[PDB]
Amino acid sequence: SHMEQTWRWYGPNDPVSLADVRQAGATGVVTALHHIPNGEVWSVEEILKRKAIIEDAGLVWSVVESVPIHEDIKTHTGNYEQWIANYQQTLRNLAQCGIRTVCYNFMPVLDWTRTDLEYVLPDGSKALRFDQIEFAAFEMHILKRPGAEADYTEEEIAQAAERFATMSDEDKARLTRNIIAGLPGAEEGYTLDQFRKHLELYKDIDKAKLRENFAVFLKAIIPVAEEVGVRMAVHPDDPPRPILGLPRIVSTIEDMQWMVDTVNSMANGFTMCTGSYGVRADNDLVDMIKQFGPRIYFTHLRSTMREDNPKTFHEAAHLNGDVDMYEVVKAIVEEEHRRKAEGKEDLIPMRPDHGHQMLDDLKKKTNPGYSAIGRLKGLAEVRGVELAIQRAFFS
Numbered sequence: 001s002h003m004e005q006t007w008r009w010y011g012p013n014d015p016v017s018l019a020d021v022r023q024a025g026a027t028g029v030v031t032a033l034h035h036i037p038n039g040e041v042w043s044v045e046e047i048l049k050r051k052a053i054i055e056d057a058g059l060v061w062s063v064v065e066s067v068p069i070h071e072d073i074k075t076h077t078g079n080y081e082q083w084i085a086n087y088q089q090t091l092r093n094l095a096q097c098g099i100r101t102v103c104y105n106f107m108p109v110l111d112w113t114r115t116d117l118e119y120v121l122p123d124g125s126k127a128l129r130f131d132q133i134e135f136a137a138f139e140m141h142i143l144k145r146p147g148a149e150a151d152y153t154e155e156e157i158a159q160a161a162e163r164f165a166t167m168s169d170e171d172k173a174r175l176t177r178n179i180i181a182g183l184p185g186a187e188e189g190y191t192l193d194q195f196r197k198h199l200e201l202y203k204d205i206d207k208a209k210l211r212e213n214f215a216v217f218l219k220a221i222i223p224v225a226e227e228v229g230v231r232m233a234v235h236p237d238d239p240p241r242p243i244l245g246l247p248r249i250v251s252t253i254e255d256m257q258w259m260v261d262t263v264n265s266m267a268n269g270f271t272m273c274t275g276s277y278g279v280r281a282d283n284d285l286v287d288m289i290k291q292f293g294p295r296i297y298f299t300h301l302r303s304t305m306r307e308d309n310p311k312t313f314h315e316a317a318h319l320n321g322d323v324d325m326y327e328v329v330k331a332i333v334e335e336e337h338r339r340k341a342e343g344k345e346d347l348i349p350m351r352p353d354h355g356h357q358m359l360d361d362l363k364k365k366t367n368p369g370y371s372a373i374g375r376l377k378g379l380a381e382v383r384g385v386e387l388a389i390q391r392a393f394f395s
């Protein structure tokens, strides 16, 4: 009702129109200039061109998601100094156009990851899924990483061998593309060969080293962001665990605390993605919002469901997964109200994040799972929760 409701739109080529977005009830668009090569500067011209298309629909461009961080920055090799300079200028250009929140990630090599893009739920709709056994089969029988066996239980290894033996040639190709070619929003894509040689750049890069590389980026970017009035909102790792022998360093509350200890400026903040942090049971989403609320500048309000094997998860309906959506929304609303009580008034934009593929969308070739109807449904569910919390606790 008063909640700042936003919606990820990929641009003119997105099958979801800006009319669909408005009818969904979003007043704000989340988007990026996806066509601009990784690490190059986003010109004012390109920015204003996207901004105008959105304003034309009677919407506003609320959040950027994402400005990509070149791999040379994450490995701290090659042209990193130039890429950082460009990233800085992108932020200058963005703020000059009046776009003041930037979402970004530090997932190395791979972005957000799923093994199955078309998992049929009992109601007949389709969800994204991360099957631990599918993923083990990829790592040990397709990628053949040495020695990936250390990331798995004996039983999972036996199961991975069995699943692989039932896979068709095309099952194996699809699994591979699913994992490495890039899902919607990802700024990197690989063939198996490209992927395998890219992993080698990380043979001497452990958790501590990646943190060091991230620190170089933050200390360079945050002062520019602060100077220019832009707030940075880091998106967590998805899944928030180390995969493929590579570290993942935006997964837990310790990692969030590390980021604040590294750069104190308020320009250094967070995207509270409940779908991603919520994958692992040990993340206390509500505590995360209580502790880091002042720095939460963007939320993704979706939910996942862990299965019998707790590393296997699929995307749930927004109110029926592992995320206690009531408690999460309550904490966000309480954060917005303390801002208001400290004198300001500074809402936290939300987007429904992912949706199931359902109704008309089942007959379409869709961006997984950025189809419209499922995302509309999640948006509406969360709208309702938030409105009732406003009336029950803040009327």
Ligand SMILES: O=C(O)[C@@H](O)[C@@H](O)[C@H](O)[C@H](O)CO
Residues within 6 Å of the ligand: 065, 066, 103, 105, 111, 112, 184, 185, 186, 235, 238, 273, 275, 276, 300, 353
């Ligand atoms: O939670 C997620 O995985 C999503 O929000 C992503 O689709 C999005 O691209 C994020 O910015 C991570 O790259």
Ligand SMILES: [Cl-]
Residues within 6 Å of the ligand: 006, 007, 008, 351, 352, 353, 354, 375
């Ligand atoms: Cl969205």
Ligand SMILES: [Mn+2]
Residues within 6 Å of the ligand: 235, 273, 274, 275, 276, 300, 353
């Ligand atoms: Mn998210």
